[PDB]
Design a protein around this ligand. Sequence first.
Ligand SMILES: Nc1ncnc2c1ncn2[C@@H]1O[C@H](COP(=O)(O)OP(=O)(O)O)[C@@H](O)[C@H]1O
Ligand SMILES: Nc1ncnc2c1ncn2[C@@H]1O[C@H](COP(=O)(O)OP(=O)(O)O)[C@@H](O)[C@H]1O
Length: 288
Amino acid sequence: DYLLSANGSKAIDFVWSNFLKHPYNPKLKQPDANVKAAWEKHADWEHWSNMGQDWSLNTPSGLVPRPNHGIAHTLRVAQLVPVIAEFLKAYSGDPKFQKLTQKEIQKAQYMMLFSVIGRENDMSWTDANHYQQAFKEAYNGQYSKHIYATFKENAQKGFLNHVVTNKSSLIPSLFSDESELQYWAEALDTSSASGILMALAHDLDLMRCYDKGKFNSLKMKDLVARLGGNEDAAKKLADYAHDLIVATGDRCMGYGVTQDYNYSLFGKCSLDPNECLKQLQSIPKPET
Ligand SMILES: Nc1ncnc2c1ncn2[C@@H]1O[C@H](COP(=O)(O)OP(=O)(O)O)[C@@H](O)[C@H]1O
Ligand SMILES: Nc1ncnc2c1ncn2[C@@H]1O[C@H](COP(=O)(O)OP(=O)(O)O)[C@@H](O)[C@H]1O
């Protein structure tokens, strides 16, 4: 609903045009030879080829960049926020979440829009830990900037760039004042109701790229705990996330009726934010 607000649509246009519609950065497709050498030594370490994974996806309506962190994902995680909030209020048995007003829900939703824009490849936090440990392992302890810190700083920069010209629109309607805006700009680099809310949106959407075992263990347990041990409420929440994924033609690997990409549908949603919203809106929200 706030995704249809003036602030909402403007943020969407901004993150899409300035970040999400662009290819990943070729300089971050792989490490160099010396870094590669250090990486392979750990047979437990997921392969450096993870740096190049989900680079782009071929689709009837065009080549889709960053298919695992593009506009479909971004809008879905934003979409989920208000529903997650409703479920937390009903089942958590935690007062913090009854402290969750619409405005705080709206801020969380808005901020989710900026949640993946800093990405320059599809590597995980773990891959980045490994890269740095191997840039080290390779060159006698020499430091290099954590790749995820760069992603965070980029996302932060994007956000500051957008809010600078939209303050009269965003304050006081969405952000109460400039210092509240400051806190959220800071939170983008680096445990509150808002954070847990946003983390759970991220968590639920990972069903798109985690297998069932990995998704159910790494992500569903944490949601189940968040909802007062109510497994059933968690499942309904997961069903809606599933349906949003299916509505956008995305792959779903970790929950429900799994599927590969619906290429036709995903190319359409991923290359037109407006089509993506329409499809997401087509899914009935679960009742609490
Ligand atoms: N530790 C992690 N495990 C799994 N997925 C992650 C992890 N960290 C980030 N992600 C994925 O990366 C996305 C955020 O990327 P991030 O590096 O924060 O980009 P940006 O800094 O531009 O927001 C999230 O949507 C999430 O799906
Ligand atoms: N688990 C929680 N649930 C809800 N609110 C929390 C939780 N933990 C801390 N908080 C409070 O929520 C606020 C989050 O920051 P923010 O929304 O920017 O505050 P403000 O709206 O006053 O600027 C913090 O002031 C903190 O006291």
